[PDB]
Amino acid sequence: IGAHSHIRGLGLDDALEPRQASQGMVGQLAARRAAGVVLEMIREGKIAGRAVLIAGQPGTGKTAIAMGMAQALGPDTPFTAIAGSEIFSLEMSKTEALTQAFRRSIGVRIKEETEIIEGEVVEIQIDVGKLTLKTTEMETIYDLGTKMIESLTKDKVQAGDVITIDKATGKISKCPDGELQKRKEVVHTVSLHEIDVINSRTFLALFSGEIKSEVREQINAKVAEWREEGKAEIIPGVLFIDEVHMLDIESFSFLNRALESDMAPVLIMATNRGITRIRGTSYQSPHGIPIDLLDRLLIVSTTPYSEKDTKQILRIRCEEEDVEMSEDAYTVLTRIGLETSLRYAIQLITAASLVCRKRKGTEVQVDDIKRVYSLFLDESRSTQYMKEYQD
Amino acid sequence: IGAHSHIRGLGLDDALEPRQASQGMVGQLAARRAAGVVLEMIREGKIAGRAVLIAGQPGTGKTAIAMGMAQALGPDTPFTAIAGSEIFSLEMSKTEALTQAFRRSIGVRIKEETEIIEGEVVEIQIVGKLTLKTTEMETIYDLGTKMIESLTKDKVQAGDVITIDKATGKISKCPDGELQKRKEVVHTVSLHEIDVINSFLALFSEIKSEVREQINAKVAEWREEGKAEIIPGVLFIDEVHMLDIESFSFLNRALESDMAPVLIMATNRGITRIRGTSYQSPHGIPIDLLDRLLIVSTTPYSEKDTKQILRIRCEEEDVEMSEDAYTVLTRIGLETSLRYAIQLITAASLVCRKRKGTEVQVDDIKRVYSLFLDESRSTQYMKEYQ
Amino acid sequence: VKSTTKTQRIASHSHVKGLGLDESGLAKQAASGLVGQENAREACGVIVELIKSKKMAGRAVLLAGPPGTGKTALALAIAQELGSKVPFCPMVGSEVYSTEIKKTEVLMENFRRAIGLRIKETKEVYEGEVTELTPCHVIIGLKTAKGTKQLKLDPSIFESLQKERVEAGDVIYIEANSGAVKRQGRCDTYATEFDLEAEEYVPLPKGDVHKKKEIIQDVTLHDLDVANARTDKLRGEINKVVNKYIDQGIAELVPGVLFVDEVHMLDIECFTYLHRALESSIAPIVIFASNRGNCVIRGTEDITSPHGIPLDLLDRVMIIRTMLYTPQEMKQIIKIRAQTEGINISEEALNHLGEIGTKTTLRYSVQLLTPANLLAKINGKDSIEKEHVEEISELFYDAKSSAKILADQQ
Amino acid sequence: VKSTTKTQRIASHSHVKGLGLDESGLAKQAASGLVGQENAREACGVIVELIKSKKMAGRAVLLAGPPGTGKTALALAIAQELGSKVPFCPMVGSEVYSTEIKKTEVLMENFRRAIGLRIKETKEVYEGEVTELTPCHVIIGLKTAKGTKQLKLDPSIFESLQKERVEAGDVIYIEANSGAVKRQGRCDTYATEFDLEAEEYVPLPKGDVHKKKEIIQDVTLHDLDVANAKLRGEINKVVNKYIDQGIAELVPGVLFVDEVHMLDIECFTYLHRALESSIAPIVIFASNRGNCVIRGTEDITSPHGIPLDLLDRVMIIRTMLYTPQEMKQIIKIRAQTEGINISEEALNHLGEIGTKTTLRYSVQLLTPANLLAKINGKDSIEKEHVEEISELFYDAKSSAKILADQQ
Ligand SMILES: Nc1ncnc2c1ncn2[C@@H]1O[C@H](COP(=O)(O)OP(=O)(O)O)[C@@H](O)[C@H]1O
Ligand SMILES: Nc1ncnc2c1ncn2[C@@H]1O[C@H](COP(=O)(O)OP(=O)(O)O)[C@@H](O)[C@H]1O
Ligand SMILES: Nc1ncnc2c1ncn2[C@@H]1O[C@H](COP(=O)(O)OP(=O)(O)O)[C@@H](O)[C@H]1O
Ligand SMILES: Nc1ncnc2c1ncn2[C@@H]1O[C@H](COP(=O)(O)OP(=O)(O)O)[C@@H](O)[C@H]1O
C-alpha cells in the first residue's frame, strides 16, 4: 500500500558513489552501484534484449532498488510491481495477466494541450462574468464563473491563482506573470493499460476482467498517430516481477516475446530460491528460470542487512508514521528486524502506536513493544509452534 | 436557407379568425382558418393517423402556410421542407431519403446547463469591461471588442443576454436573476442531427444502421429520464405528385408510428396518374392515403396582397423601392410567378448600385426584367424557335 | 402478449357489433349498429352460415360496390358475427408494394394477423359482484356465493377498472396474478327485460372470490411474432409450439377474416399467393373489395379481367353487391357515429351532412364531424349547427372537388 | 501533377479572355474576344458580382439559347472573369450515363474538376533579368537589383529555357530547387507603347536573384486524385490539412452542364444536393429545347427538362442570335486565332453558311479550307476554296434532308 514510499532515486550520483543515507535509501551499497550501471545503460540504450534479476533473501530492499531506479530514470517514469503468482487467476489466462502487466509498464507522456488562462488576479471579479487578470504581457480581465469564483474566494485571494482552463487556481505568488492566455504542454504519462481501461465500458466491477483484443488494436493505432504527430513520447518504464520462480515455463517464453520489442520496458525480477524445479517441466534450473532467459540476465545480488542499517531504515519509516518512540524501543525493534523479517518490524510499529494511545501516551516505550510482540506473531513463530502441535 | 424567414405564426388571431396582415401571412383567410383548425386539432391530439395536403397553383404560399403552422405549434418545433423529386437520389434509395426526411422532423428538446454571461447593462463599458446588473448583484462584467461591437449591434443598451463567452441579445434596459443564469437551455436537436453527429468536402468527396439504433436508444433513454423531450414537428413534402406508389406505402407505414410528425404535402396537378402503376387519381395519390387526408386549397393571389408581400420581402432584403416600381413589380408578379418577382429584387439592387444610387427606380426594374428571362417567356421563345 | 392491431383502421366503425339479423334470416332496418343496405347483409349472414357448416372450402367473398357503401363495415360485421374476438385484418392492396420488404412478407404478415388462437390458461381471477369502491385503497367489496369480499384494489388496478368502466353492481373478475381488470358485465339482480341471464348483466358468481378460471386469451399469430422478435427461424418456432398446444387441448385455432380493399392493385404473383394460401384448410376468409370494373391485371399489361382478378381465382369467388345508400340512411349513419364519438348535433346539421355525403361520399361526411364539433368548441358551443357544417365544408374539400378546383384554372 | 483538362473542348474558345464589360455595367460591342450578346453579357456580369458577393445561396444559372450562340463561350468568359486560373469544366449531360462507370462517379469527377486550389508556396527561385545566355554548365547572367549573377545551370534547364523561348532581356524566374525555367516576360527597359509594366515585359526584379517567391500553383482536386493512382477520401483529408496549415486557399470554379435536358432526375437531385453546400462551385446549365419532358418521369414536362424543384432556384440568362455582321466578325476572330488569312468575300460566304446551319459548322470549315488553299499554293483562302469545302463536307441538317428526300 504505502511501502517504498520514500525511495526517490538511487541517491548515489558522484560518478556512481552511493552515500549511506542519500534520499531515504540506506545500505546495500554494492547493489546500488550496480543499479547505477543499469540506469546509464537505459539512457545509452544498450540494454535491449536484456533483463535484470535481483537475487537475495526476503526483505533486503530488492523492491526498494526497483522503485529507486524508476525514480532515478525520471520523476514520472511508470513502475509496475507484480507477483509471480499474480498471473494464476481464474478470470484471466497467463497470457492476459502478463499482457496487462507489460501494458501498464509502458508509459506515454502525452503532452496534453492546456490553454492556460492564468494571471495575477488584480481584483476578484464576481463572478458568470469575468475576473481582472494581469500578467507581464498585459492585463486581460478574463472569463470566470461562480463555482469557480467560489473556489477562488475559498483560495488565497489574491495570491496569483494560476488558472489553467478554468479548473485550477495556483495561489503561490503574484506566479502567473507570462502571457495571459498562453499554452502549456501538460506532461501526462498515461500507461498503455490506462488507455485500455478508458475504452473499456466497465463501481463494484472488482466484485461483480479481460480487455478485448480489438480495444488493444485501436489504442495501438492511436498511440502511433500521436507518436508520429509529436505529442506522445513513449517512455520505457520498469516492470518488476516479484517471486519470479512462481512463473512457469510457458509464461517464461512469453516474457521472451515481449522483451524483443521497441516498446519493451526494462524487466526487473526478484527471487530468493536457488536451484529449484522449473514450473511446468521436470528439470532443475537456477532460480527456477529457463536457460534461454538466464543467459541474457543482468543479475544483481542484494546483500543481507546489517544492524545499524536496520535502525536507520526504521527511523525513516516512523517519520512517515508520525510515531515518536524511545531509543530502547528503537533497539528492540532493530533486534526484531534482525531475528525476524524487516516487514514484521514495520507491522509492529503501527500496532504499537495504538498501544501507546490506549494508555494515553505520546511516545511508545519498550513496554508497548513487548505487548504487541506477544499479541501478533511472525510467520516463523506461528508456523514453528503450530507444526509442534501437529506431531 | 433564407427564403421566407418572415412568418412566425399563422396569424389567425383567436377562434380561427385570421387578422389579415400578421406575422407574415397577409392572405389566404380560408387556408389560414383551416391551418389553425388543424393546429389545434394536433394540440388536442385527434389528428393521429391523418395528414394534410395543401392544393393550389404555384406561388400561392403553400410552403408559407406550412411554415406558419410549424411556428405556431412551437417556437422551436422542427420544420423539414423537402420535394417529391428529392427522394430519387443517387446516393440513397427512396427508403433512406424518406427515413431521413422523417427523422429530420422528430425534434428532441434536451436541457443543457449553461452559464450565460448576462446582466442588464447599466453602462456600456468598452477588450475591456462592461457593467452588468442583475437581481444577484451588479458588477463590470468583462467582454471582448467583438462582444461589445455586437452589443452595439443590438439595441443599446437594452439587455443584453450574452451567452457564456458568446454573443449577446437585446431584451430591455431587463434580463435579471443571477449573473450566472445557470439555465439548462432546451436545445431542440432532431433525430437526424444526432445520427449525423455520431456518424468538409464530404458532399464532393449512408450511415449503416448501428448508429441509428444507438441514437434511438440514447434519445429514448434521455426522454424517459426527463432530460430530453421528444416533440414531433411538421414534415412538408412539396411536389407530392412526384412520389410513387412504393414511397406512398412507406409513408402510410410511417404514419402508423407514435413518433410520427404531422405530415403536410403540397400538390398542384389534380387527376394525375400515380407515378407507380397506371391508374389515374386526384393529385396522383393512392386513394388509401387520400381517404384520410385533410385537404386545404390555397386561392390565387390578388394585387394588394401581392404588393404587401413584396413590401415585406424588400423590408427583409434591405432594399428601398419607388412606388411606381412597386406597382410594376406587382403587375409582373400577377402576370408571372411571385418567385420571379422576388428574384427581380436582388438583381435590381445591384443594378441600382451600378449607377451608384440609393433607391431603386422603375428603370432598374425594367432593365433587370429585360436582363433575366422568367419561366414562361423562355419556353415560349424556345418553342417558337423550334 | 400485446394486442398488435392497427386500431385506427377499424376505429371508424367501432359502433358495429355484428351483422344484426333475425332468426329467420332477414335483416331489420337498423340493428347492432348497422343501418341502411340489407340485401348484402343477408348475403353476409349466408356466408357466415356457410362458414359454420364448413362449406366454404377454398372459396372467397368479393364485395363489389362504390366507395363508402359499407364494404369494410360488412367485413367487420362478419368478423363480429363469427365471434367477438375473431381476428379482423383490414388491408389495402397497394400496401404490398413496399420499398424495403417483399410482397411475400407483407402478404404473410396480413395472413398471420387474420388467424386467431384461443389459449385457455387456468388462472386465479377475482370474480365477484362489485358492491362499493371506497378508496380507503381502494377497498372494494366483491359479492359472491360466499358474500361480499372486500379487497384493496391498488390505485393502479382501480384506474384500470375505470378503464373498464366498472361501476357498482357489476359482476366482473379482476386478474390478481396479472394485476389486470376486465369487465364481464353487471349483476343479474338488476337484469331488466332487455337484460337477460349470462350476458352484459351476468349473474352473481357461485364460488370463492378467487377462482381458477381458464382465461381465454385471444391472440393472433402475428401478436406472438412481435414478442420473440423483440426471421424465418422465429416463424417456424412459434408454429411448432402453437401446433403442439393445439394437439394438447389448450389452444383452439380460430380462423379470422382477411379483408383486402383495392384488390385491383395486386400483381399476378400476389393473386397466386392468395389462391395458394386460401386453398389450405386453416386459411381464413379473403374478403375482397373492388371500386372499379374490368381492369387490366397488373403485371400482364395486355389482359383485362373482371374486377382486376385473374380468372383462376375469380371462378372461385362469391360476389356480393352493395347499395349506394340514400340521404335518410346516411343521416342515420352519421347520427350513430356522432353518438359513438360523443357529439351533439342538430337535425338540420345532420340533413346537411347527409346531402354532403350523397354528393361526395360517406367517408367525407363522417370525417367532417370531428372538425365541425371542434370548431363549435372553439366558438364556445356544445352543439353543432348548420353554419358550422357549412364552414367546415367550405374549409376542407374532398379529393374530387379539389382536383376540379385545380383543373378549373389548369 | 499533370493538369487533367480537356484541351480540345475549350480550344475552340481560346480567343475569349473575359466578359468584356465596363465598370458601369453595360457591355461594349467587342472586347476581350467577345462580340455581341450584350444582354447575356450584362447578365453574366451581374452573376459574377453575385458570386463575388457570396450571394449565390444555393442558386444556379441556366443559359437558354439556340445552338451556336456562345453559351459555352459565355460560361468560359464568366470563369475567366472570376480569375484567369479559375477552373472551368464543361460537360454535356449525354455522357453522365456512360455504358460503364457510374452516373454518380461521373458527376463526382466533373464536380471535382471544377474546384481549384491556390497553393502559394515560398520557394527560392532565380528571378532575374537575363543579361547574357552563355550555355557553357550554362552560366546565364541574371541582372537584378543585386546585379548580374552567373548562376550555373544544367543542360536540362537550358532546354527548358529554350522551350520557354527565353532570350536576352527576358525577366525570367528559374525556381532553383526544381530547375524549371518559366518565362515571365521581358524587361521594362524595352517597354514601348504596347509593352507595359508587369506583363510579358515585366520590370526589372527588385532584390537578390535567389529570392523566396510566393509561387502559386493552380491545381484542382481531380488532378490530385488521378495523381494518387477510400483513396478519394484520403486525398480530401490531405487537402483539408493543407488549407488548415495556411497555404491552400480554396477557389470554387464553374461547372458548365450542356444538354441538360437529357439528364436523369436522380442526377438533378444529386446536383441540387451538391450545390446546396457552401464550398460548391457555381453550376451553370445550358439548353436548347423548350418545355421538353423530364427524363425519368415520362409524364411531367418542365422547362428545359429541369425539374421544378431545381428550376425554382435558377437564374435564366437568354442568349440571342447573330446577324451576318457578328457571324463574320466572329469567324474572322477565330481565323486570326488560328493564324488563317481569309478574304472578306470568303468571310461573307462563311457568314451566310453559318446562318443556315450553325456557328460551329462555319468555324469547323476553316481548317479544311486553309489546307485546301495551302495545297493549291495560295497563302490565303478565296471564295472558291470556301465554295469547294462547302460542297465537299456537309452539315447534319442538310445531309439528313438529303437522306429523307430520297426516302
Ligand atoms: N535502501 C533502503 N532504504 C530504506 N529502506 C529500505 C531500503 N531497502 C529496503 N528498505 C525497506 O525494506 C523493505 C523492502 O521490501 P522487500 O522485502 O525488499 O521487497 P521484496 O518483497 O522484493 O523482498 C521496505 O519496507 C523498505 O522500507
Ligand atoms: N401568407 C403569406 N404572407 C407573406 N408572404 C407569403 C405568404 N404566402 C406566400 N408568401 C411568399 O410569397 C412567395 C411565393 O409563395 P410560395 O410560398 O413560394 O408559393 P407556393 O408554395 O404556393 O409555390 C414566397 O416568397 C413566400 O414566402
Ligand atoms: N352498414 C353500415 N353501418 C354502419 N356504418 C357504416 C355502414 N357502412 C359504412 N359505414 C360508415 O362508413 C365508414 C366506413 O366506410 P366503408 O364504406 O365501410 O368503407 P368502404 O368505402 O371500403 O366501403 C365508417 O365510418 C362507418 O361508420
Ligand atoms: N458572344 C460570342 N463572342 C465571341 N465568340 C463567340 C460568341 N458566341 C459564340 N462564339 C464562337 O462561336 C462558337 C460556337 O459556339 P457554341 O459552342 O455553339 O456555343 P453553344 O453551343 O454553347 O451555344 C465558339 O467556337 C465561339 O468561339
CSV table of C-alpha atoms and ligand atoms in Angstrom, one decimal, chain D residues 12-13 15-16 33-37 65-74 256 258 322 330 334 358-360 363, ligand 4:
chain,number,residue,atom,x,y,z
D,12,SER,CA,-12.4,26.4,-79.7
D,13,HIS,CA,-13.0,29.4,-77.3
D,15,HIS,CA,-10.0,33.8,-78.1
D,16,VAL,CA,-12.2,34.5,-75.1
D,33,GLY,CA,-12.7,38.4,-77.7
D,34,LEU,CA,-16.5,38.7,-77.2
D,35,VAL,CA,-18.8,40.1,-79.9
D,36,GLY,CA,-22.5,40.8,-79.4
D,37,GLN,CA,-24.7,39.0,-76.9
D,65,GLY,CA,-30.4,29.8,-76.4
D,66,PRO,CA,-30.3,28.1,-79.8
D,67,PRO,CA,-27.3,26.0,-80.8
D,68,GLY,CA,-24.2,28.0,-81.7
D,69,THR,CA,-24.9,31.2,-79.8
D,70,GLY,CA,-21.9,31.1,-77.4
D,71,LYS,CA,-23.4,29.5,-74.3
D,72,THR,CA,-20.2,27.7,-73.7
D,73,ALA,CA,-18.3,30.9,-74.7
D,74,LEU,CA,-20.3,32.9,-72.1
D,256,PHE,CA,-20.9,24.1,-67.2
D,258,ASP,CA,-24.6,21.4,-71.6
D,322,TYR,CA,-26.1,36.6,-84.5
D,330,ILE,CA,-16.5,36.0,-85.0
D,334,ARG,CA,-11.3,32.6,-84.9
D,358,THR,CA,-24.7,27.0,-87.1
D,359,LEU,CA,-21.6,28.9,-86.0
D,360,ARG,CA,-19.9,25.5,-85.2
D,363,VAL,CA,-15.8,27.6,-87.6
E,4,LIG,N1,-20.6,36.0,-77.8
E,4,LIG,C1,-19.5,35.5,-78.5
E,4,LIG,N2,-18.4,36.2,-78.7
E,4,LIG,C2,-17.4,35.7,-79.4
E,4,LIG,N3,-17.4,34.5,-80.0
E,4,LIG,C3,-18.5,33.6,-79.8
E,4,LIG,C4,-19.6,34.1,-79.1
E,4,LIG,N4,-20.5,33.2,-79.1
E,4,LIG,C5,-20.0,32.1,-79.8
E,4,LIG,N5,-18.8,32.4,-80.2
E,4,LIG,C6,-17.9,31.5,-81.0
E,4,LIG,O1,-18.8,30.6,-81.8
E,4,LIG,C7,-18.6,29.3,-81.3
E,4,LIG,C8,-19.7,28.2,-81.3
E,4,LIG,O2,-20.5,28.4,-80.1
E,4,LIG,P1,-21.2,27.1,-79.4
E,4,LIG,O3,-20.1,26.2,-78.9
E,4,LIG,O4,-22.2,26.6,-80.4
E,4,LIG,O5,-21.9,27.8,-78.2
E,4,LIG,P2,-23.1,26.9,-77.5
E,4,LIG,O6,-23.1,25.6,-78.3
E,4,LIG,O7,-22.7,26.8,-76.1
E,4,LIG,O8,-24.3,27.8,-77.7
E,4,LIG,C9,-17.4,29.2,-80.4
E,4,LIG,O9,-16.4,28.4,-81.0
E,4,LIG,C10,-17.0,30.7,-80.1
E,4,LIG,O10,-15.7,30.9,-80.4
